[PDB]
Amino acid sequence: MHISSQQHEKAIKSYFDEAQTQGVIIIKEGKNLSTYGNALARANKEYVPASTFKMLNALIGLENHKATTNEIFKWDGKKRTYPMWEKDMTLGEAMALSAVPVYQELARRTGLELMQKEVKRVNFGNTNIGTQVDNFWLVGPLKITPVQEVNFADDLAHNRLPFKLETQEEVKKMLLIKEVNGSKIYAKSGWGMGVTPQVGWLTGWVEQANGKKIPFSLNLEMKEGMSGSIRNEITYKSLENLGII
């Protein structure tokens, strides 16, 4: 339409400035990547994936028969950081709650040798998981850039990753987080607190009413004290600004 690129860029930058943090959002339309936000150089820097790795953990675990989508992972009765984690959950429920204890169990079922082979086969990020199967996506050594995250979201949204179609569809069903008019937003959040500085993610895609899918990845610096909902607020204001939703 009639709004200049200068004005779109200024508006999206201001969403990050108003939240008092530093970040980028990458949007892909077809093969074209557009970078917006207030710290554009973050686009090709590596950060831990944190809870965004649960997308790939779920695909690996389902494809290799380490879980089913209806299996209930029981809470072991020990105290958790968050009360909503102190309950029995399917992978889908654990995805929406970012319940790392469920995904650590799934990683342990997959085990280090298979985990490293699958992460290499999908060529996710720097592809390095090191020697600790239960925390490699949290504290290193696995890292990924925001460009690589939006390209992963593009691959999953279009069923292009090297898994069965059914496996990709099962995991995509776990990622629906919002519906706006007739658009649907599928995405996974992350907040890596085990590194310094802390990293915030929201990576996913918009499925528009006509069926087109527009992948995006938000990446920002988080600080103890911030609200996790700023990730969604920035992302939705940016997508609305560009007329994607």
Q: Which residues pair with 192 in a beta bridge?
A: 199
Question: How many Cβ atoms are within 10 Å of 85's Cβ, its own excluded?
Answer: 17
d(CA 129, CA 9): 36
Question: How many Cβ atoms are within 10 Å of 62's Cβ, its own excluded?
Answer: 22
d(CA 121, CA 115): 10
The identity of residue 128, as a single letter, is N
d(CA 16, CA 34): 16
d(CA 26, CA 150): 7
d(CA 155, CA 161): 6
Interacting residues of 62 by C-beta distance below 8 A, sequence separation 6+: 68, 69, 91, 167, 170, 171
Secondary element (H or E) of residue 109: helix 100-110
Interacting residues of 104 by C-beta distance below 8 A, sequence separation 6+: 134, 135
| PDB experimental method | X-ray
Sheet holding 198-207, edge to edge: 32-37, 23-29, 213-222, 198-207, 183-192, 176-180
Q: Which residues pair with 220 in a beta bridge?
A: 23, 200
Q: Could you tell me if 215 and 157 are in contact, meaning their C-beta atoms sit under 8 angstroms apart?
A: yes
Largest CA distance in the chain: 57
CA dihedral 94, 100, 101, 104 (to 10 degrees): 110
Residue numbers annotated as active site: 51
Q: Could you tell me if 177 and 216 are in contact, meaning their C-beta atoms sit under 8 angstroms apart?
A: no
Interacting residues of 244 by C-beta distance below 8 A, sequence separation 6+: 27, 183, 206, 208, 214
d(CA 38, CA 10): 9
Domain count, the chain: 1
Beta-carbon-side half-sphere exposure of residue 80 (alpha carbons within 13 Å):
16
Secondary element (H or E) of residue 132: none
The identity of residue 142, as a single letter, is L
Return the DSSP state at 89: B
Interacting residues of 141 by C-beta distance below 8 A, sequence separation 6+: 126, 128, 129, 130
Helix 100-110 with 54-63: angle, nearest 10 deg: 40
Residue 167 φ/ψ, nearest 5 degrees: -65, -45
Domain coverage including residue 225: 5-241
Q: Which residue has the tokens 């086969």?
A: 121
**Listed residue (116, 77, 70, 78) closest to 94, CA to CA:** 70
Q: Which residue has the tokens 């496996």?
A: 167
Q: What is the experimental resolution, given in Å to one decimal place?
A: 1.5
Which token pair is 135? 């925390």
Write the secondary structure of 160-192 as one string of H (helix), E (strand) and C (coil).
CCCCCHHHHHHHHHCCEEEEECCEEEEEEEEEE
**Listed residue (157, 147, 149, 125) closest to 35, CA to CA:** 147
Residue 150's domain is classified under what CATH number? 3.40.710.10
Which token pair is 32? 């074209």
What string of DSSP letters covers 46-88? -B--GGGGHHHHHHHHHHTTS--SSPPBPP-S---SSGGGSS-
Q: Which residues pair with 203 in a beta bridge?
A: 188, 217
